[PDB]
């Protein structure tokens, strides 16, 4: 309804470490701009969802809940911020979808046809004493 991405500035620790892969000598000296996250479970605030974000297993989040995202594709630090900022939203909000499904199923049109049926089979059980 009213959707504006928060992702608290001053609450998220961003760690810039070096990259991985191939590409020459460029990839191993000034590729430290690559980003790796740090989103502790202590900055929760919904009270119920963050623990449901910790119990259910998935990657990007360890056994403690310090959510990390090591993005290694870009060359600038700027693109590493926003791309890593989107997945944090893409993981948490996607995993917090604890579907309030529902039930049930109880025969309501079966017994409007099933009911008249068996009672009509009473003439089937009249093949006896009179």
């Amino acid at each position: 309804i009213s959707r504006h991405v928060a992702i608290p500035d001053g609450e998220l620790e961003i760690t810039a470490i070096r990259a991985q892969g191939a590409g020459g000598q460029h990839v191993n000296k000034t590729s430290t701009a690559i980003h790796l996250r740090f989103d502790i479970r202590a900055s929760s605030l919904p009270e119920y969802y963050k623990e449901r974000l910790l119990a259910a297993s998935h990657h990007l989040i360890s056994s403690d809940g310090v959510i990390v995202i090591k993005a290694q594709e870009y060359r600038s630090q700027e693109l590493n911020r926003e791309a890593a900022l989107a997945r944090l939203v893409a993981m948490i909000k996607e995993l917090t979808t604890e579907k309030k499904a529902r039930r049930p199923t109880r025969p309501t049109r079966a017994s409007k046809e099933r009911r008249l049926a068996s009672k009509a089979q009473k003439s089937s059980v009249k093949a006896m004493r009179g």
């Binding site: 109880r106 025969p107 079966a110 099933r114 068996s118």
Partner: protein, 123 residues
């Protein structure tokens, strides 16, 4: 007659199937009685009958209909069982006895009071 076919292949004393897969010749068995639920019957009827799956202490994970009114059982509630089927719920071949160490009877069922392990009211 074909007696030569009989002298080779004897008369097979065909052993019949059991209607109680609990244990051999056991009158009763103690069940861990888990996952309480209520499901619908088949073509003959239509109702909301209370049933319960039975984790047996001989190792089985069977099902049993709860013939009774008083719900005196839950997740665990280790009870006892008596043989026999209900003939209306496809799958059940046991009965939850309403007189176990865990499951008691229902009050005020005067006519044929020994039914459902109900204690006789001296009043």
């Amino acid at each position: 007659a074909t007696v030569n076919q009989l002298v080779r292949k004897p008369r097979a004393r065909k052993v019949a199937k059991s209607n109680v897969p609990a244990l051999e010749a056991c009158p009763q068995k103690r069940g861990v009685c888990t996952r309480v639920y209520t499901t619908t019957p088949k073509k003959p009827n239509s109702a909301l009958r209370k049933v319960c799956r039975v984790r047996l202490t001989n190792g089985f994970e069977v099902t049993s209909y709860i013939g009774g009114e008083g719900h005196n059982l839950q997740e665990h509630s280790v009870i006892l069982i008596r043989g026999g089927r209900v003939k209306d719920l496809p799958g059940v071949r046991y009965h939850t006895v309403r007189g176990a160490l865990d499951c008691s009877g229902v009050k005020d069922r005067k006519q044929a009071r020994s039914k459902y392990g109900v204690k006789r009211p001296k009043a």
